[PDB]
Amino acid sequence: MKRIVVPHRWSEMNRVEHPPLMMKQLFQGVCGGLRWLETKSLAQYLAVRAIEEVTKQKRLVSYDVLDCTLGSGYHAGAVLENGGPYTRVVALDCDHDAMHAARDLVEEFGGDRFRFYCCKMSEAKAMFGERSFDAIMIDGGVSDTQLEDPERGFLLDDEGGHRLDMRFGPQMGVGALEYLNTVSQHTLVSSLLAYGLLEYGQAMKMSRAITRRKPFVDSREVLTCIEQAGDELPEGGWRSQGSRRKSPMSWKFLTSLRCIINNEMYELRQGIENALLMLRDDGRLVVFSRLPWEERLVRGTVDDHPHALLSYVEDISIDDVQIYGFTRHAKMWVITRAASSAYALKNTTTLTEEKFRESSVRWLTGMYAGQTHGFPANNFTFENFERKEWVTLRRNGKPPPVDVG
Amino acid sequence: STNDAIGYFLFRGAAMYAGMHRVFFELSKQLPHFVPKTMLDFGAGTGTAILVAKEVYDPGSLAYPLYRSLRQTMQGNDSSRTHQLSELRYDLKRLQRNNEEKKKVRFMKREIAEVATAAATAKKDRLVREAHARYRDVVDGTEWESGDPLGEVRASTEDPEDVIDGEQKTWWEKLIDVENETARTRAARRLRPLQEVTAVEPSPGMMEIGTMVLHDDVPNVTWKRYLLPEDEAIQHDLVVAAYSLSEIATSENRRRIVQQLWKMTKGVLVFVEFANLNNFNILMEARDWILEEKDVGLWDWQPTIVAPCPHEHRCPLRHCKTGVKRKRMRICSTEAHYRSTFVEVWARHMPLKVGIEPISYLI
């Protein structure tokens, strides 16, 4: 009658969980909208009818939410707690260790209200289809559970030195230490310039120092080189409350590298784009931004997408910044997928005379053309099925016999 | 850059797809029993090699169906053969006229229940093709089961059909075996094709385009930015270098890279390049470099050429007498034919309804 127990590691014994940020604001921004009001009215109608009184059994009423980034279940848990019985969440963290938090949510609430998959956010559209979720929430960046972990490499000041493998989930390849040991100076500079934090001269200086003081045995030596190239890293470690431009080149380089080895730019871009397709009409998408490039990308994507219109933006409360020590720049972008074309509304504020003239020139010159005659192009169509294609769907159910060929 | 990668994929997308199909066709016919559980790409700019490998070794796991009537779909693999038989039974049902008398019932013998379970599984695999999205079931309004919200027990459940050896003909019997589909599904489950695949691409723009290209069709691909010399410790079932050796920089040691690629191969390493003088010299130098490994180590691991070279001596075309004067008699290439896309048709002043892709390859 012996029990088999796997010994706990130091990380397993001393792990800490990410604190909740903007609980009430995120709940108002995610369980709120036309879909939410219609769900509540449907609940009213069903309650009124209830007072009046093999096939796939459907739910009478439910509000579906996707969590592209579930770390600790605090945000995924808020929508299930402050919500009601008519709520469901599907989580898609990229890190296998988030199942630890997912298990707590499943234990607390129903197993019929929660689901979890270990995947990156950009593949949500691949693992689902268009118009599948009423709400989507994206919280990129790193979780506090990973910062202190001596194995994850995010840990700073690290008396002794560790392996600087500061990457999100196994879906990425080389970590930061070997990335800095192998990358070229031009490649590092070009990769760093993609995030804006580090101006060309600073990127050149930092990449020169790295390339000149390779190879790096571990984090203490990497940090020694980063210290020499630029100023001392600021107090508070990764979360510095100072201004973006005045923050030291060492901190900006560390943040940029942490994004570089996780493809955060592409991941967030495709997450936003895929959300705007896999969301339902006038559904709601919320995305958290904490860096200037993230804010810039969100603003541009919402202003350019021909269905997305920014509902509002909420900053972080100073009380939360004080108690949990979040960056004071953390804001929340709630976006809504307009059922119709959003440009008719956006041109209300963004339309200049030069834009009007270049638009007329484009119409005159026929620049707005595409491709409809061509091998791959002739096989493409809009979302609604065609008359010729409903026939294909109805016909590929039973074929006829044939004698010759 | 990313725009340069976009243009490269658009102009050279179809040609590279054609070349990879032309190579994997011969690979599948020559080694019919090979199935790459694990795959590696050296320089997978746009993931065309991944797309073709998925299409050949697992045609039934793609988002969209393949064109059945095309010669490119008739592969000699075991998994491809299983899927081909599964699809062929449909055409046989078409050939014959059956009663097709379904038995629709309602709530009020057990063979009906089990056949209904089989039909439900068939519908489950049907919706993946129809919607071009796996896991499409959950997004329905249907209730969720409370059994496996995290799917942990499904993944940690021991299969009772996979058993070690110790742990425990005639045309009529062959016909019955082929008619029975449960064995075919069990064989497919035993053969996990391309379950884990890693793609190496230092160029950020090409990596960014390849991720997008591959996400819809091949799930869970691990993207590495660089190929470390310490990475020899892991060998993959298939290792492909498609149009990469030629673009490896001259400062880096191509011999070291190729030796690492061979030493990290658990299988059928495939080099592919465009038919050119420089590319052919590179491929022949690689041929010699790997063939230098014949006189060292366990015999069951030494390299062999399965195609196109039937000899393992020096290339008689590389050492021909005519080739010194004539540039035509120097390349032992082959040809692929495809339907040229509108990008190529526009970039050329010709209609080119059939484009030609010359390639030199080595398996």
Binding site: S184, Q185, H186, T187 | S1, D4, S251
Partner: peptide, 25 residues
């Protein structure tokens, strides 16, 4: 049209005819 790849050429073989940039136009 060709010089726009100058920003893509790596630093090493970027100024090949002159092994320096301070004295470069």
């Amino acid at each position: 049209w060709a010089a726009k790849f100058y920003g893509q050429v790596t630093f090493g073989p970027r100024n090949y005819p002159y092994p320096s940039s301070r004295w470069l136009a």
